[PDB]
Design an enzyme around this catalytic site. Structure first.
Site, PDB file in Angstrom:
ATOM      1  CG  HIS A 104      -0.576   0.427   2.447  1.00 49.64           C
ATOM      2  ND1 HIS A 104      -0.231  -0.473   3.431  1.00 49.64           N
ATOM      3  CD2 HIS A 104      -0.425   1.657   2.994  1.00 49.64           C
ATOM      4  CE1 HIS A 104       0.108   0.182   4.526  1.00 49.64           C
ATOM      5  NE2 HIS A 104       0.013   1.477   4.282  1.00 49.64           N
TER       6      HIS A 104
ATOM      7  CG  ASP B  62      -0.069  -3.734   2.892  1.00 49.05           C
ATOM      8  OD1 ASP B  62       0.411  -3.314   1.820  1.00 49.05           O
ATOM      9  OD2 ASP B  62      -0.322  -2.987   3.873  1.00 49.05           O
TER      10      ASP B  62
ATOM     11  CB  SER C 167       2.305   2.299   6.761  1.00 45.49           C
ATOM     12  OG  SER C 167       1.166   2.530   7.566  1.00 45.49           O
ATOM     13  N   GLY C 168       4.716   0.041   6.514  1.00 50.39           N
ATOM     14  CA  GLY C 168       5.804  -0.465   5.685  1.00 50.39           C
ATOM     15  C   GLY C 168       7.011  -0.909   6.501  1.00 50.39           C
TER      16      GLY C 168
HETATM   17  C1  LIG Z   1      -8.983  -2.602   5.511  1.00 55.16           C
HETATM   18  N1  LIG Z   1      -8.491  -1.279   5.862  1.00 55.16           N
HETATM   19  C2  LIG Z   1      -7.229  -0.905   5.288  1.00 55.16           C
HETATM   20  C3  LIG Z   1      -6.613   0.437   5.700  1.00 55.16           C
HETATM   21  C4  LIG Z   1      -7.294   1.030   6.892  1.00 55.16           C
HETATM   22  N2  LIG Z   1      -6.869   2.279   7.512  1.00 55.16           N
HETATM   23  C5  LIG Z   1      -7.644   2.615   8.565  1.00 55.16           C
HETATM   24  C6  LIG Z   1      -7.515   3.820   9.470  1.00 55.16           C
HETATM   25  O1  LIG Z   1      -8.363   3.893  10.345  1.00 55.16           O
HETATM   26  N3  LIG Z   1      -6.495   4.659   9.257  1.00 55.16           N
HETATM   27  C7  LIG Z   1      -6.172   5.768   9.960  1.00 55.16           C
HETATM   28  C8  LIG Z   1      -6.925   6.912   9.771  1.00 55.16           C
HETATM   29  C9  LIG Z   1      -6.609   8.056  10.479  1.00 55.16           C
HETATM   30  C10 LIG Z   1      -5.543   8.059  11.377  1.00 55.16           C
HETATM   31  C11 LIG Z   1      -4.788   6.911  11.569  1.00 55.16           C
HETATM   32  C12 LIG Z   1      -5.086   5.760  10.855  1.00 55.16           C
HETATM   33  N4  LIG Z   1      -4.349   4.637  11.060  1.00 55.16           N
HETATM   34  C13 LIG Z   1      -3.137   4.343  10.525  1.00 55.16           C
HETATM   35  O2  LIG Z   1      -2.603   4.912   9.594  1.00 55.16           O
HETATM   36  C14 LIG Z   1      -2.495   3.247  11.092  1.00 55.16           C
HETATM   37  C15 LIG Z   1      -1.636   2.326  10.429  1.00 55.16           C
HETATM   38  C16 LIG Z   1      -1.301   1.425  11.459  1.00 55.16           C
HETATM   39  C17 LIG Z   1      -0.495   0.275  11.504  1.00 55.16           C
HETATM   40  C18 LIG Z   1      -0.389  -0.399  12.705  1.00 55.16           C
HETATM   41 CL1  LIG Z   1       0.562  -1.819  12.783  1.00 55.16          CL
HETATM   42  C19 LIG Z   1      -1.024  -0.014  13.927  1.00 55.16           C
HETATM   43  C20 LIG Z   1      -1.828   1.125  13.890  1.00 55.16           C
HETATM   44  C21 LIG Z   1      -1.963   1.807  12.677  1.00 55.16           C
HETATM   45  N5  LIG Z   1      -2.683   2.936  12.394  1.00 55.16           N
HETATM   46  S1  LIG Z   1      -8.904   1.463   8.866  1.00 55.16           S
HETATM   47  C22 LIG Z   1      -8.355   0.507   7.513  1.00 55.16           C
HETATM   48  C23 LIG Z   1      -9.011  -0.766   7.096  1.00 55.16           C
END
Ligand SMILES: CN1CCc2nc(C(=O)Nc3ccccc3NC(=O)c3cc4cc(Cl)ccc4[nH]3)sc2C1
Ligand SMILES: [Ca+2]
Ligand SMILES: [Ca+2]
Lengths: 52, 233
Positions: free
Chosen positions: B42, B88, B185-186
């Site tokens: 991604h 991913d 991420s990544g």
């Molecule tokens: C199936 N999907 C793919 C991408 C996605 N992104 C989502 C989402 O809610 N993003 C987000 C929106 C606004 C602020 C922060 C974030 N989170 C992030 O960017 C985020 C990536 C990440 C990776 C790990 Cl391991 C732990 C926590 C994490 N948070 S929900 C979702 C579901």
């Protein structure tokens, strides 16, 4: 627990059970030591080590 | 990273940072060898063109150990799906080789069966990156790390509003305010075994960051070891 389930077969890194005995091996950049258990880095900056 | 600690000198040497044309970090990566970086598929859609920075702990200042590398080949998993972030994972081959040195060294790839029975059954792994320090905040100018508990597959299925495929695993805390976040991420999820660090995950996604009853979702590296090996030729 026995073999690899017992303290990783005493291996430093990978442990496999072949026949009814432990076989240790190592990540790339390491060689298996004479005792067949320890992994010796072959160069500087082997994988997986914090740098000093 | 929300919470956690700074990576001190030499502590997180397998960390890489993808930087956009404006020289700003947008994703992490993990150094696998002198030519190959592991990252999330991604991440490839977030910059038209990008390079790889290694050896950096503080993006506010060049401290002489930093190096930039251009990307020769991008290898994205063909089954990656924007919908669910399944598959991913991507591998990058660099145009020029990385020079290993203080703060620049690869993480080890484990063998699949040993990794699954021995590494992923440990209490915790370590995630790192230059991502957000809070869900809404800005990206860290310092490289941070965080110890995260492995989470039971079932608990994680129930916690999640999105499907958790077998290509994913969960790590993190139920309520405690610590987690990866956007910009991490990544990057690497590594598991320590006797003072040796093996790559076990790729920072993939989460519902916000550090929310209560929510966990971080990581690509399960053991599901892709053969693919990685093939990709590195
Ligand atoms: C199936 N999907 C793919 C991408 C996605 N992104 C989502 C989402 O809610 N993003 C987000 C929106 C606004 C602020 C922060 C974030 N989170 C992030 O960017 C985020 C990536 C990440 C990776 C790990 Cl391991 C732990 C926590 C994490 N948070 S929900 C979702 C579901
Ligand atoms: Ca710097
Ligand atoms: Ca949580």
């Amino acid at each position: 627990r026995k073999l690899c389930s017992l303290d990783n077969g005493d291996c430093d890194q990978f442990c496999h059970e072949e026949q009814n005995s432990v076989v240790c091996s190592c990540a790339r950049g390491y060689t298996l030591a004479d005792n067949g258990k320890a992994c010796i880095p072959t160069g500087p900056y082997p994988c997986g080590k914090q740098t000093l | 990273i929300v919470g956690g600690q700074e990576c001190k000198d030499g502590e997180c040497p397998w960390q890489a940072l993808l930087i956009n044309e404006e020289n700003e970090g947008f994703c992490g990566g993990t150094i696998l060898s002198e030519f190959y970086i592991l990252t999330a598929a991604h991440c490839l859609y977030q910059a038209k063109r990008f390079k790889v920075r290694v050896g950096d702990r503080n993006t506010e200042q060049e401290e002489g150990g930093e190096a930039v590398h251009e990307v020769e080949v991008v290898i994205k998993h063909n089954r990656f799906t924007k919908e669910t972030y399944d598959f991913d994972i991507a591998v990058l081959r660099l145009k020029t080789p990385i020079t290993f040195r203080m703060n620049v060294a690869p993480a080890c790839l484990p063998e699949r069966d040993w990794a699954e029975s021995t590494l992923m059954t440990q209490k915790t792994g370590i995630v790192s990156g230059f991502g957000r320090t809070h869900e809404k905040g800005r990206q860290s100018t310092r490289l941070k790390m965080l110890e995260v508990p492995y989470v039971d597959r079932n608990s994680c299925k129930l916690s999640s509003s999105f499907i958790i495929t077998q290509n994913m695993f969960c790590a993190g805390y139920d309520t405690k305010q610590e987690d990866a976040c956007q910009g991490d991420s990544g990057g690497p999820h590594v598991t320590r075994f006797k003072d040796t660090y093996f790559v076990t995950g790729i920072v993939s996604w989460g519902e916000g960051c550090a929310r209560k009853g929510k966990y971080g979702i990581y690509t399960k590296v053991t599901a892709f070891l053969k693919w990685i090996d093939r990709s590195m030729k």
